[PDB]
Amino acid sequence: TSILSIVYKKDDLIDLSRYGAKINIGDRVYYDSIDKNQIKLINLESSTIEVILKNAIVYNSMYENFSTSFWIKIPKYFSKINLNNEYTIINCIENNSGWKVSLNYGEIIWTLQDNKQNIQRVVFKYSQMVNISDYINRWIFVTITNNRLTKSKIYINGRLIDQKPISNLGNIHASNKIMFKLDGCRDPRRYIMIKYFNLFDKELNEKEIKDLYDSQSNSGILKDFWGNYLQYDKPYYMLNLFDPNKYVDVNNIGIRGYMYLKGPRGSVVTTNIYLNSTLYEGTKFIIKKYASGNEDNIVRNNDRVYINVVVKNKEYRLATNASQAGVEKILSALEIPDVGNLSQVVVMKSKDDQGIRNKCKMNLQDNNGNDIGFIGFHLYDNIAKLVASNWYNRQVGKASRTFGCSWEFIPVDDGWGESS
């Protein structure tokens, strides 16, 4: 049911579908080292991806429903130059007729234009004043459905954001060639990322789109704050989803010193461009592989690893005393040789028992494979102290709302632009 499916291969891009669409790529198109299947497009002329379909699959009907899907990453807009700068990213428009996706300040737009130059637009809007954003500089699954008889709809990560009737529109033509380049951007240093572009000749429903989202989500592999692959031997800042205005911090070194959530988080401001909350506050959490036999640096689910703590540019280890008072017992950072037999083994957990994708959670386990439990925070005398507990596991067993068993990894990225 798929007509175009651009997928990475050995130093090239191919089409999974049985149509053999011609592909040509510019000399300035980049690829991520770890996840090469993601494509980076900079604001230049040579940064071009041309893919040409066949004449038998060119959209030239008037009752033909069709859908598209892709993953997109849009960095932060830093200055006023990006305001009111609607710039195109994908065109299938010839003779002023076709379909086009474009980006504006906090906006992603689908545009259809028939032979009569009638323009229909669907928009997705995300703010930039928020403390922590779910869309800025983070991967987004965008899919668009077009039913010529009822409506055209937008789905962001499988949920409905906007719909507009298109019954008024007449015959819509399409270009034989389809476009990947930043067109109409005044900003000389604005780039995007795009991957997993798929086209279907029918209107997809909620169920199929949710299935596609889950399939392409890579639920079996851990993801960071920016939606990329989690890697070992790299410093990550730490965020608690339920209490995101505090950061991991230390006070004293060793067992007698406790790691806690200190706040509040600071701010980055640009006077009516963005007023986000600082994400580079606190102490880094490096991940060290222990028993994962995989050669690659990618962290997978159920992996058993170790976690370094960077305090005054010195690397310590997570451990807690297994034998102490209560289940919500205090974790600590220790000098790397003096761990002894303290519980240090941590299991990475991304998807649940049923396989439904959720955020990163770490489960402290001992040498004997006994679950100390999920890592989180609990309040002791008004201090949010870090503790590993099986209480989270108990609520998971009871299908209750766990409180604090979810962590988020934030590496330093160029798309955020914060000053360390």
Place this chain on the structure above:
Amino acid sequence: GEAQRRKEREELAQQYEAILRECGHGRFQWTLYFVLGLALMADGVEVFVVGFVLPSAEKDMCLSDSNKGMLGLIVYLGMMVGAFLWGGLADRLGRRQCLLISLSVNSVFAFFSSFVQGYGTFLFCRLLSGVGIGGSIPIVFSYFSEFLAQEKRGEHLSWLCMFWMIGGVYAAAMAWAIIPHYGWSFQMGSAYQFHSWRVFVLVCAFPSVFAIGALTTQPESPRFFLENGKHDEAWMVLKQVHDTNMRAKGHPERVFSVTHIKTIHQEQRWGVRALSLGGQVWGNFLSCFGPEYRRITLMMMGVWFTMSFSYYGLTVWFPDMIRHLQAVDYASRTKVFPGERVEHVTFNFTLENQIHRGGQYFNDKFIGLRLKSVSFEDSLFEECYFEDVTSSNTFFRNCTFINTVFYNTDLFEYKFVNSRLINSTFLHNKEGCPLDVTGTGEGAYMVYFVSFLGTLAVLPGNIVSALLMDKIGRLRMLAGSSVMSCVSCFFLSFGNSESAMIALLCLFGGVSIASWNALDVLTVELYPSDKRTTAFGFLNALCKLAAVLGISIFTSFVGITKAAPILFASAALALGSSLALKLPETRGQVLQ
């Protein structure tokens, strides 16, 4: 019917005078004088507390405007409610009973407010304390008067106004001796902090407790017993007075000759009792506005209202204007530096009262600097770095920040007025109030000194009024003092320096006190013994309401002109004096 009641009341008044003349003046009267003086010193103290603690409480409880102004005028709304309520209740329950209950309420809620952390809670506590201390002046004057013979009533009642002065002197001295020690940071509970102004509040509560202690050892006034049909214990109280007096004199052998006393003939449960009390008090109130007392009561309303309005207006106005003049001098001394360009260099310094304009600082780091009333205008900071910065009354208006970092600074978002920040980060912001809270330092000593001088100015008038009240008369003294107050009000313009305001404050305070004395004596003397506390307390409540209105009005006009306060004060006092000359003469009469 009415004639019979009038005859009975007159007979009781005449015989009561006779019994008091027999008992005589001596130790009993002086003992009661000291006790009731403490009760009045408490009310003297209570009117200074919030004004002395507001400079510290504004920082300690994050007090905005429309909150400082209210806390100021709260001791007066509470006194307004309390005066009426306890004055009305004192004629059905007794003077000493109601005095104990009101003083106890005052003491409790002052103690509570000493520890309260919030603002609304502090408002409520300080309102109830005002309610409690509201009923002090009416009960006290009406209570002491019922033990004095007509020979020297004005002289002996006027001495009772020394104590209110003493209360203010106490307040000022304790504020001077306690508040200046800002270091005291007693810690009991991490979330709470105990400063020196709270200690001041506690020590201000003390006088009221001492008042209750003293009062418990005095007897209810015999007159109240006689009106309410209770004959035996009125007899016993009069016997006690006679016994104490004569034993102190040196003749502990003579006998109380009075055997029978004329007494006014008397003609769900909780709710019924409350309704009955309310009905009786309402009756006493309206009987105060009866045919026999309607002219007197309206002249009394006029005199009380006009005097309170003028006095409170000017009393709040003089410190206001002194602060205004200080401000003007400070603003005159301000230094200006228009334009300066700075390259890589470290800046530590402390600047006070400065304006830097058109600055251009490029990659400058600001470590460990204190700003007091320093404004940066039309400046450009680029790759700057602010660390360990504490600022009072500091603003950045029309400034542009580029790639600057504010680390460990209390530069909140209200100190950047119409600024433009680009790629700027705020890290580890210091704890402070969301809005400007201003700052008061070394200038509190002079505030305490000024208060002290106000009270001391009051002293000569008290002495002279007490000595001449019976020789001259209440109407003459009231008039002669209100007129001089009006003249003093006219002389206000011949003052624009701080020293001038201090001298003028002293003059006005020294002049108005005799008028206030005379109006206290007159108001006691002019009402029957079954309505004295009710009437006195309704007039005192009116006094407090006038205080609220005059404080508001006269503080509204500070720094605007010196014509509005002079005109308002002079007009009010002239009308007060005019109305006072139309009141009936009460000297050389039995207390009826």
